[PDB]
Structure 1
Amino acid sequence: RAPAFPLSDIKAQMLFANNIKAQQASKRSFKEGAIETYEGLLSVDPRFLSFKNELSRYLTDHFPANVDEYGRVYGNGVRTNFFGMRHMNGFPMIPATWPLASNLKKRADADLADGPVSERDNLLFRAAVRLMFSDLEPVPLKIRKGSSTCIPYFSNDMGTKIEIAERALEKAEEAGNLMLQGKFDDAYQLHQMGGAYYVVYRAQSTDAITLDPKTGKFVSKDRMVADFEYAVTGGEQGSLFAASKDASRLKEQYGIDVPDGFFCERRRTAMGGPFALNAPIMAVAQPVRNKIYSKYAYTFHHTTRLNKEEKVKEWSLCVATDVSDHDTFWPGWLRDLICDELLNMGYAPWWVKLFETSLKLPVYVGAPAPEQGHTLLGDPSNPDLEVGLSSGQGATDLMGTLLMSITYLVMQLDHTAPHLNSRIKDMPSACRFLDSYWQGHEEIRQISKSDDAMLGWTKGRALVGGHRLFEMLKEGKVNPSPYMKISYQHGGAFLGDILLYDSRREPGSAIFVGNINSMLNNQFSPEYGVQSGVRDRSKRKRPFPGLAWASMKDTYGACPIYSDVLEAIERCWWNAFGESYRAYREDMLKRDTLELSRYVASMARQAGLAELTPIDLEVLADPNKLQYKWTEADVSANIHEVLMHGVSVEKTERFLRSVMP
């Protein structure tokens, strides 16, 4: 069972400093309302909604899903209905989940392992730790403009952020040693290292909606949540249940006109780490990213639809997998292991302790619903929680990638290629093998990022075992892993590019195309408003929205029905506004192209987009994509300086050298 204090308790109060930003954060009440979809257009504007009720129905009709029995996608590229867009962007289901303080029961009830099951698996996890954290070169600690330091300051000043990071890099050592000693309160008071994650509820603009041919009414995918008693008990007491996506309450509450077949948004839980403590972790995490995106680029570094295509064209079989609820399942033990293995490689203990702690931290629940929240979970005097992989941690992507790359490789040895086991006998041989495997130099292969992956087999011994494995997934009565709950993607795709199989149904004669449905998501169901109130556009969640139109053709244009869908929009837009969408988006293009030349140094006063990668555009349109789809390397140096700002390398270098071996 888990400790839980109210905002009034000192342990709560101590999480927010004596200033307005912070205090408001502690009290923050349920907040809810429409978004400025584009400049001067509301997500709920009745004209826009009509455009949506029409465009959704039309495309769903005249282009249903081309996905075969083996979750392979062919023909038109369409892998589902277009009813996702049918939400009142800006209004949550009530209530949102309370975050579960311990996933141990969740995991055992789901028949998953409490540690590496074989001595071989134990070697492979620990091998990954060594390859990944081995030969790191110090880089600048890059920071994102207009992002909250969270506990305890909640600042946004890039000024104040650097001063905080630089500080935390000097006093990181003193703070770690403090915790190795069990003086957790002490470290947090002297250097803001400790405390808690702050729970914000980001939204998921587009979730399953379907049409029941029988009734004629619409159905939103129920989304199960926990109440407080469920969250603190690990699942023991309290209840689980579907949240109320019903959007009717808006007509009475705000007298907003709600058309038939429109529902509230899904709210995903999301966390903010005490920056004091993320800084030392990112100082290592970033150099790490750099090693595996270079040396091990086959399996880890992915850019365009053709970057991926080259790799999978040489496969004889391509199985696209798909993990369930990856984050809240991530095993507490993988952390204790990764930490033990680092300690051995010769990482400073104090740093390893800071790392360990960033994973067992308490969480402040903001406001899940009206009349709720304002509660701290777990005692910060002695961090014990087992929350899964905490979304705001300094290294979340690495923890996800390391856990899953080894899970998939294991699932491959287990089911298709027993003959290789003999290559894994001790630590060095383990490493020598993994190194070859990750470079793609073996008859089995993976491309992955955390929970998206495609697994491949080339002509060889393993090859037939692959088809059996695949078959076990199509049937799907057994889970092919001990570690997580795996299965096959229905209409497979990798990092938002769909895999287009032809008549052959072979990875040699297939191609990667843009997901057309993701265009409709980025354009009519954005995650945030335009923030026309924020002067500095580099701080906005969407700095230059109009630019996405330049890089649009370049991105989705390979999609089979690109042509059609643009016309579908244009017409449905016309019907609903008495305007040309194309025009609209074109004007918006010229505007932001100019506005940009103010933010870009070298460009400017009217020079155009000539020198910019399609990526560059998509990223400037949704910098959120830089945080899951691409990375610093994929974005033109000068564009990078618009969105991020770093800490002097003379300082990361000096710090990194007291951490590593």
Structure 2
Amino acid sequence: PRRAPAFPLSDIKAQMLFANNIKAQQASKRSFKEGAIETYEGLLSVDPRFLSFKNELSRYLTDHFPANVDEYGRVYGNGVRTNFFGMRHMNGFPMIPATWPLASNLKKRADADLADGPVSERDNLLFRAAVRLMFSDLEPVPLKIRKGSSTCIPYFSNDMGTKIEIAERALEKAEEAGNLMLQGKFDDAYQLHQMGGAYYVVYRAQSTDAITLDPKTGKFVSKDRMVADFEYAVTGGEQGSLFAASKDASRLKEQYGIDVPDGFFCERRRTAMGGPFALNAPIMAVAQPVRNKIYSKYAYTFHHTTRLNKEEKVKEWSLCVATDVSDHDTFWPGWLRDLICDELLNMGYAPWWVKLFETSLKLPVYVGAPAPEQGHTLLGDPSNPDLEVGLSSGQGATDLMGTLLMSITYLVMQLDHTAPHLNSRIKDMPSACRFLDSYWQGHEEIRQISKSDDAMLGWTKGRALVGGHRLFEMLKEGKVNPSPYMKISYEHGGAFLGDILLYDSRREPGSAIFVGNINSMLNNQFSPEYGVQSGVRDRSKRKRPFPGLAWASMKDTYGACPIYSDVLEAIERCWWNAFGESYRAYREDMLKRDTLELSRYVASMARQAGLAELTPIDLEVLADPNKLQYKWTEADVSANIHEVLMHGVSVEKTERFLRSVMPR
């Protein structure tokens, strides 16, 4: 029932994705690679002392700090939600094979009993109202670019100067490209302006994943991760197979001479997609202004910073429901892309821009290396973009596409199961906008705090409260999906954007507090996703620019966890046993070295200026800028720090571009 076309690297369609330069040619051909990450300078993830440390620590902490999660998934007591065995992976060595990305998610959605469009007129008005509220009265801002990020297809440049030139040229030629696409001239738009082609698939590590200890055998068991073979991916699951990837690490001894202790596994690998930068630049020029609007006007629902910022909102609720979405990106509906595009057109957005936006969400995908002897295949024909992959991770507005889908999905759930008395407030477009604008500001008796697939749903006192409790009960039972749009359940140990909601004996939001997740501190410190990249001279271009700095923000981030001191002492004791060294002293030296190095990058910082002016967010972001992609935003970071990590295209060029896109 319609298989996606697939082309080998040798085919002209795939060759046209890679420019005649070394980096682009190497990206096309790069074979499956694996190896121990440099966890910290001079320390490999597979160092026997380090693995001994992880074995002792994971065992000790699980033993002394068992999970304290009630029947309703509320975390209490010690603030622990699971075992500490997630650290037991051979970081840098992936599970084999990684998945082939599904070319079409239509069958996947239909088989999961999810809708192929808005179910009712109300829902149609609410999704359209979300577009109207989000894309409205936008103010131009400079187009900010992450330092060291790739331009991907076709140039594969990491040079800031080249990236600035590409973005400026893209804003100049986006109209001409979009008009070519409106005429079905995708090849011309790509050939002339590099707008089109495909997403470049890279496989990224999820460094920690579920591991359990079988009491009967005393053997560890890793969580099975289902992967699609090539046949399954091109047929949207009609043919081929979906099977468990192998996390068995025994192979490392034979292949690499690495001693593998018992109960240590290969890492979970996730697909990540890099977009063609010339196509993303015009999209990002609108996406950043949208973020600024939603994080300002709709800050209640959308702008999340500290544990206290979150706590102030939640404390006022009579009921707090922490939801979970199954595989958000792969289930994300193409009908939403079409609805968004249709509404933008109705608002008066430039048709050429809407076509670029639509095209970015139908684009083919170039598969690199999921396993040895596999990959190097283009899925979909770039001459006529028609894929249904769900949400591509490298699309210029992915966060906004997930936020738009989910914010409405949760409101619909609250309407359907708890507040039918509010349905009369949604009669047409003006009333749908008025209602949504009030709801997003936290002015209704039904509330939410969300970001993409993470949310907390609230009820104050009122008519909807009783329904709220029935919905929570329905979730606990887990027999009926409460949504026609996505697979929704409750989170087993409710947390929001990394902070655990710690309840007391009362099990009420009013007396509950947000605390940092101690397990995330452990994940970040002992299982980083990337190595230190010691060979990359420019630290601002590394995946972990200043790792040592995280020690300075630790107490601020994690200090409120009931077991904070206990964990730090357990670390010290175990590190002493494994290395014969003080972990605290080791981290204090790393903090000193990184603080000194940082002044080289900050113009306001003198040769030995300390971290006095820096916030804990600034420090966490400098140690892990990936937190800027899922946890925080540009506005949450000090201005002098933002400039270390990003560079921008002038507001003059974006202002002129934006004027041509927008209705008014």
Q: TM-score range by the shorter chain?
A: over 0.9
Report sequence identity in percent: 100
- SS of the residue corresponding to residue 621 of structure 2 reads helix
What displacement does 1:351 show? Answer: 0.1
User: Gaps spanning 5+ residues in structure 2: where?
Assistant: none
Q: Does the aligned pair in 2 maintain the 1:600–1:639 contact within 8 Å?
A: yes
What displacement does 1:338 show? Answer: 0.3
- SS of the residue corresponding to residue 253 of structure 1 reads helix
Q: Does the aligned pair in 2 maintain the 1:179–1:187 contact within 8 Å?
A: yes
Q: Does the aligned pair in 2 maintain the 1:7–1:376 contact within 8 Å?
A: yes
Deviations 1:510-532 (A, max 9, x none): 10000000000000000100000
Partner of 2:552: 550
- SS of the residue corresponding to residue 455 of structure 1 reads strand
Cα distance in structure 2, aligned partners of 1:621 and 1:276: 29
- SS of the residue corresponding to residue 587 of structure 1 reads helix
Partner of 2:247: 245
Cα distance in structure 1, aligned partners of 2:231 and 2:464: 48
What displacement does 1:607 show? Answer: 1.2
Deviations 1:277-308 (A, max 9, x none): 00000000000000000000000000000000
Cα distance in structure 2, aligned partners of 1:83 and 1:604: 43
Q: Does the aligned pair in 2 maintain the 1:538–1:642 contact within 8 Å?
A: yes
- SS of the residue corresponding to residue 315 of structure 1 reads coil
Partner of 1:266: 268
What displacement does 1:421 show? Answer: 0.2
Cα distance in structure 2, aligned partners of 1:640 and 1:595: 16
What displacement does 1:557 show? Answer: 0.3
Q: Does the aligned pair in 2 maintain the 1:594–1:604 contact within 8 Å?
A: no
Cα distance in structure 2, aligned partners of 1:170 and 1:609: 41
Q: Does the aligned pair in 2 maintain the 1:127–1:431 contact within 8 Å?
A: yes
Deviations 1:39-67 (A, max 9, x none): 00000000000000000000000000000
Partner of 1:213: 215
Deviations 1:553-607 (A, max 9, x none): 0100000000000000000000000000000000000001001111111112101
- SS of the residue corresponding to residue 610 of structure 1 reads coil
Deviations 1:336-355 (A, max 9, x none): 00000000000000000000
Partner of 1:142: 144
Deviations 1:99-121 (A, max 9, x none): 00000000000000000000100
Partner of 1:112: 114
Partner of 1:351: 353
Partner of 1:71: 73
Cα distance in structure 2, aligned partners of 1:628 and 1:73: 23
What displacement does 1:215 show? Answer: 1.0
What displacement does 1:255 show? Answer: 1.0
Matched ranges for 1:172-571 at <5 A? 172-571=174-573
Q: Does the aligned pair in 2 maintain the 1:492–1:499 contact within 8 Å?
A: yes
Q: Does the aligned pair in 2 maintain the 1:296–1:438 contact within 8 Å?
A: yes
Cα distance in structure 2, aligned partners of 1:427 and 1:599: 50
Deviations 1:453-476 (A, max 9, x none): 000000000000000000000001
What displacement does 1:232 show? Answer: 0.2
Partner of 1:607: 609
What displacement does 1:449 show? Answer: 0.2
What displacement does 1:375 show? Answer: 0.3
Cα distance in structure 2, aligned partners of 1:160 and 1:413: 49
What displacement does 1:262 show? Answer: 0.4
Deviations 1:10-33 (A, max 9, x none): 000000000000000000000110
Cα distance in structure 1, aligned partners of 2:573 and 2:213: 24
Cα distance in structure 2, aligned partners of 1:5 and 1:604: 54
Deviations 1:409-461 (A, max 9, x none): 00000000000000000100000000000000000000000100000000000
What displacement does 1:540 show? Answer: 0.4
Q: Give the alignment's TM-score, normalised by structure 1.
A: 1.00
**Alignment pair present for 1:122 and 2:124:** yes
What displacement does 1:221 show? Answer: 0.2
User: Gaps spanning 5+ residues in structure 1: where?
Assistant: none
Cα distance in structure 2, aligned partners of 1:640 and 1:122: 38
Deviations 1:601-653 (A, max 9, x none): 11121010000100000000001101110011000000000000001000100
Cα distance in structure 2, aligned partners of 1:599 and 1:334: 42
What displacement does 1:490 show? Answer: 0.4
Q: Does the aligned pair in 2 maintain the 1:103–1:386 contact within 8 Å?
A: yes
Cα distance in structure 2, aligned partners of 1:637 and 1:580: 35
Cα distance in structure 2, aligned partners of 1:216 and 1:639: 48
Cα distance in structure 2, aligned partners of 1:121 and 1:528: 42
Count how many residue pairs are aligned between Structure 1 and Structure 2.
661
Cα distance in structure 2, aligned partners of 1:659 and 1:278: 15
Cα distance in structure 2, aligned partners of 1:421 and 1:316: 22
Cα distance in structure 2, aligned partners of 1:79 and 1:268: 23
Deviations 1:154-185 (A, max 9, x none): 00110100000000000000000000000000
Matched ranges for 1:564-643 at <5 A? 564-643=566-645
Q: Does the aligned pair in 2 maintain the 1:168–1:276 contact within 8 Å?
A: yes
What displacement does 1:399 show? Answer: 0.1
Deviations 1:222-270 (A, max 9, x none): 0000000000001001001000100000000001000000000000001
Q: Does the aligned pair in 2 maintain the 1:73–1:79 contact within 8 Å?
A: yes
Q: CA RMSD in A?
A: 0.4
What displacement does 1:323 show? Answer: 0.3
- SS of the residue corresponding to residue 433 of structure 2 reads helix
Q: Does the aligned pair in 2 maintain the 1:36–1:42 contact within 8 Å?
A: yes
- SS of the residue corresponding to residue 576 of structure 1 reads helix
- SS of the residue corresponding to residue 257 of structure 1 reads coil
Deviations 1:351-396 (A, max 9, x none): 0000000000000000000000000000000000100001100000
Cα distance in structure 2, aligned partners of 1:630 and 1:222: 31
Cα distance in structure 1, aligned partners of 2:53 and 2:323: 35
Deviations 1:473-502 (A, max 9, x none): 000100000000001000100000000000
- SS of the residue corresponding to residue 361 of structure 1 reads coil
Cα distance in structure 2, aligned partners of 1:605 and 1:390: 42
- SS of the residue corresponding to residue 570 of structure 2 reads helix
Deviations 1:172-228 (A, max 9, x none): 000000000000000000000000000000000000000010111000000000000
Cα distance in structure 1, aligned partners of 2:432 and 2:633: 29
Partner of 2:104: 102
**Aligned equivalent of 1:80, options 72, 79, 82:** 82
- SS of the residue corresponding to residue 170 of structure 1 reads helix
- SS of the residue corresponding to residue 661 of structure 2 reads coil
What displacement does 1:38 show? Answer: 0.3
- SS of the residue corresponding to residue 644 of structure 2 reads helix
- SS of the residue corresponding to residue 364 of structure 1 reads strand
Cα distance in structure 2, aligned partners of 1:468 and 1:604: 59
- SS of the residue corresponding to residue 550 of structure 1 reads helix
What displacement does 1:97 show? Answer: 0.2
- SS of the residue corresponding to residue 657 of structure 1 reads helix
Cα distance in structure 1, aligned partners of 2:207 and 2:276: 27
Q: Hey, which bits of structure 1, 4+ residues long, moved more than 4 A? A: none
- SS of the residue corresponding to residue 171 of structure 1 reads helix
- SS of the residue corresponding to residue 565 of structure 1 reads helix
Deviations 1:73-129 (A, max 9, x none): 000000100000000000011100000000000000000000000010000000000
- SS of the residue corresponding to residue 387 of structure 1 reads coil
